[PDB]
Amino acid sequence: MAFTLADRVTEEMLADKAALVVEVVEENYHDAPIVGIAVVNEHGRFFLRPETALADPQFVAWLGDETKKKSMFDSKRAAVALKWKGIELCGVSFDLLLAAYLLDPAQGVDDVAAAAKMKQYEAVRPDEAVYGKGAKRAVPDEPVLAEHLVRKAAAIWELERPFLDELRRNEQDRLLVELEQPLSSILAEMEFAGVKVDTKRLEQMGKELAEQLGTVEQRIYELAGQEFNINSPKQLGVILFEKLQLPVLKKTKTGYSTSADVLEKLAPYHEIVENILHYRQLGKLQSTYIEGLLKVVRPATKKVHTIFNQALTQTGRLSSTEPNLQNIPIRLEEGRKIRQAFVPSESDWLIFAADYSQIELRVLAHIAEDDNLMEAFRRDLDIHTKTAMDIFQVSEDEVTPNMRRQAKAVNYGIVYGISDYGLAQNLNISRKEAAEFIERYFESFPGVKRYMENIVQEAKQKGYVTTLLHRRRYLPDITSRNFNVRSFAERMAMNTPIQGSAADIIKKAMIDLNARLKEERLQAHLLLQVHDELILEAPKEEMERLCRLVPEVMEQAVTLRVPLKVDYHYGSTWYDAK
DNA sequence: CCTGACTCC
DNA sequence: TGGGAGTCAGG
Ligand SMILES: Nc1ccn([C@@H]2O[C@H](COP(=O)(O)OP(=O)(O)OP(=O)(O)O)[C@@H](O)[C@H]2O)c(=O)n1
Ligand SMILES: OC[C@H]1O[C@@](CO)(O[C@H]2O[C@H](CO)[C@@H](O)[C@H](O)[C@H]2O)[C@@H](O)[C@@H]1O
Numbered sequence A: 001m002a003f004t005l006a007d008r009v010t011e012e013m014l015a016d017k018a019a020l021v022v023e024v025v026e027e028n029y030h031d032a033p034i035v036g037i038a039v040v041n042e043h044g045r046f047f048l049r050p051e052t053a054l055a056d057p058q059f060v061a062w063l064g065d066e067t068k069k070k071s072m073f074d075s076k077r078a079a080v081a082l083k084w085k086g087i088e089l090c091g092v093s094f095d096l097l098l099a100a101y102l103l104d105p106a107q108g109v110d111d112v113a114a115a116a117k118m119k120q121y122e123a124v125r126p127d128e129a130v131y132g133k134g135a136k137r138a139v140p141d142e143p144v145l146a147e148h149l150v151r152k153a154a155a156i157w158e159l160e161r162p163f164l165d166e167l168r169r170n171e172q173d174r175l176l177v178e179l180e181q182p183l184s185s186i187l188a189e190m191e192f193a194g195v196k197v198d199t200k201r202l203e204q205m206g207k208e209l210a211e212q213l214g215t216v217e218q219r220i221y222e223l224a225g226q227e228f229n230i231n232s233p234k235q236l237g238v239i240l241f242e243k244l245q246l247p248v249l250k251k252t253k254t255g256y257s258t259s260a261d262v263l264e265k266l267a268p269y270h271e272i273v274e275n276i277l278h279y280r281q282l283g284k285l286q287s288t289y290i291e292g293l294l295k296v297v298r299p300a301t302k303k304v305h306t307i308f309n310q311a312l313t314q315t316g317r318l319s320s321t322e323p324n325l326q327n328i329p330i331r332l333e334e335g336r337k338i339r340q341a342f343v344p345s346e347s348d349w350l351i352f353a354a355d356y357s358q359i360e361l362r363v364l365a366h367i368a369e370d371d372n373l374m375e376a377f378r379r380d381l382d383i384h385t386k387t388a389m390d391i392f393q394v395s396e397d398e399v400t401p402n403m404r405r406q407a408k409a410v411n412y413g414i415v416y417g418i419s420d421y422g423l424a425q426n427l428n429i430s431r432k433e434a435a436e437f438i439e440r441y442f443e444s445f446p447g448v449k450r451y452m453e454n455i456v457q458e459a460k461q462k463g464y465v466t467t468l469l470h471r472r473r474y475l476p477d478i479t480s481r482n483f484n485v486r487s488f489a490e491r492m493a494m495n496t497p498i499q500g501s502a503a504d505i506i507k508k509a510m511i512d513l514n515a516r517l518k519e520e521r522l523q524a525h526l527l528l529q530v531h532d533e534l535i536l537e538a539p540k541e542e543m544e545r546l547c548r549l550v551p552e553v554m555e556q557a558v559t560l561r562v563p564l565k566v567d568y569h570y571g572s573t574w575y576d577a578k
Numbered sequence B: 001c002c003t004g005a006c007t008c009c
Numbered sequence C: 001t002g003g004g005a006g007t008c009a010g011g
Helices: A057-063 A075-083 A096-103 A112-117 A127-131 A142-169 A173-193 A199-224 A233-243 A260-265 A272-296 A333-341 A359-368 A371-378 A383-392 A401-415 A420-427 A431-444 A446-462 A483-519 A540-556
Strands: A017-023 A036-041 A044-048 A069-072 A092-095 A195-197 A307-309 A319-321 A349-356 A464-466 A472-474 A525-529 A533-539 A566-571
Touching: A017 A075, A017 A142, A036 A142, A044 A142, A069 A075, A069 A142, A075 A092, A075 A173, A092 A096, A092 A142, A092 A173, A096 A112, A096 A142, A096 A173, A112 A127, A112 A142, A127 A142, A142 A173, A173 A307, A173 A483, A173 A525, A199 A272, A199 A333, A260 A272, A272 A333, A349 A483, A349 A540, A359 A371, A359 A401, A359 A446, A359 A483, A371 A383, A371 A446, A383 A401, A383 A431, A401 A420, A401 A431, A401 A483, A420 A431, A431 A446, A446 A464, A446 A483, A464 A483, A472 A483, A483 A525, A483 A533, A483 A540, A533 A540, A540 A566
Parallel strands: A017 A069, A069 A092
Antiparallel strands: A017 A036, A036 A044, A307 A319, A349 A533, A349 A566, A464 A472, A525 A533
8 A cells, every 4th residue: 555654744635635643542642642643635645743744834724624624533532632732623524433333332443443344444454453452562663653554544534435324324424423523522622621620638538538447447357356358359258258157148150249239238147247338438439539530630730631432332321531530429428528629620610510300211201102201201290209109009298218219219220121139139128029119110101111012122123222313232132042141132122222312312412502602602611421411610600601501401402202301500619519 | 361349320 | 130331459
């Protein structure tokens, strides 16, 4: 494959359509080096040294010109790496990573060669083959690097039309061009902005937490009558089931289980299990949300810059890494205080948080077209209280707080394909009763039962299920003769349209919201998405406007057979936005 | 490296 | 024997 290893940018490199590679080899692309650039267009194939091209005013103009269209793979990686150099990338019209992901998330496409494999294109090597793995990873010599980047650009160039044609075939071209590609740009902005962190506060928390871990630890050794590694399920298992001879409720492939559920169930036998559960909660706060977080905060700006993986989950959700900012504690007050350390990036700005209320159950109502469930939402009746009345067969007055929490377990459990066994184990109740709860649920919401049956039938017939905005998931195990393998696929068939349609909706909301913020020239901007909620920061002056704009945009992103409902709060820290 | 903890939706 | 994720310590 012929290409020019160029020493300067020329006009023919700047055509109004091109495949572009802006190579960042570090997995975490924030403030990462760009090791090489390739361009393929109608006029030829070119390799450019970053030091050259990125200092060349014409090439920089071209990159930032939205009418000069680029086809790329993982344009967010390039856009963010470029942002860290103060260079704007616009005009990305095709992203091969996002296209491959929409066509089949199960393939786990993470490099151009893997995408190319989908169309039997083989004139390009896998990245791991060129760079090496683990401790062996290195940028090769220029001629080897140059050929690799050009081959990746040539592949994107040849593969664009084939991928667009299949997407169009699948009714997924708009999903790519109108949803995922614009979202990619919004996520790039979010990641690059980062979130500001009050490190003094975390370090203090860590100091205090270290004291308490030592206290709990020593008390556990007292109760056990022995020292051991409490963070070793293997050692813990010997203490519990051999030394203290507590009952063995469950084994894993490797040995005795010490899961939270098992330890909870052992509480009537020995008090130490409650101490141990507490110790492990504290240890995770320390290791992950104090120490782990502080490791990744940029010391001069005190910001953390997550990476949202847009092409990973099997249902269309994002994930968040290094650090994961989608699993910051909230359920326990001690852990929830971590959120006091997430603060606005400017003086006199505030954090604004908006969350969909029960979006999965509303989506289930919509998709199952169950009159009873639809009506409950149409009238905004508390769905957990409703399900309690049905599964316990009582009037609204007689529903105790605990009955509501059990009904809640049923409501989400049904959405996740739970069995009477799992429900009984989760609520620690009789399995006979758990079975009754489920039978009563289905008797009360017959449309949901028909949905579960129908969607499993559809998956068997088509080989995949689909979401509201035409995302798909293939389920080749759905007709397996093996009960376990088939059962798992059946649960995926039932859950994916629900979870994935919810993901579709919040993504569209993010796009609609950014349009409105820019439309109104507000300084407010998105910081995070946490599956069913959006977190922003803005000047304190803008709260009044956001209180109106943010929920309206989120609620109206799509129109279902039931309303969508959005709650929202704001305050001086993420913790206080409640 | 994998497993089994913890955390979130 | 409930869906979708990431990180950490221990082994
Ligand atoms: N028994 C339960 C309860 C909750 N969840 C989950 O944890 C998430 C958050 O649940 P939650 O906040 O409690 O939902 P709400 O309906 O809003 O509860 P509530 O009305 O009391 O505020 C859910 O999306 C679901 O993934 C679950 O898996 N099993
Ligand atoms: O850049 C995000 C994009 O890159 C991929 C590889 O193509 O994932 C890589 O980067 C992730 C973010 O740092 C890492 O978590 C990872 O392990 C690495 O392979 C895609 O999966 C992702 O969408």
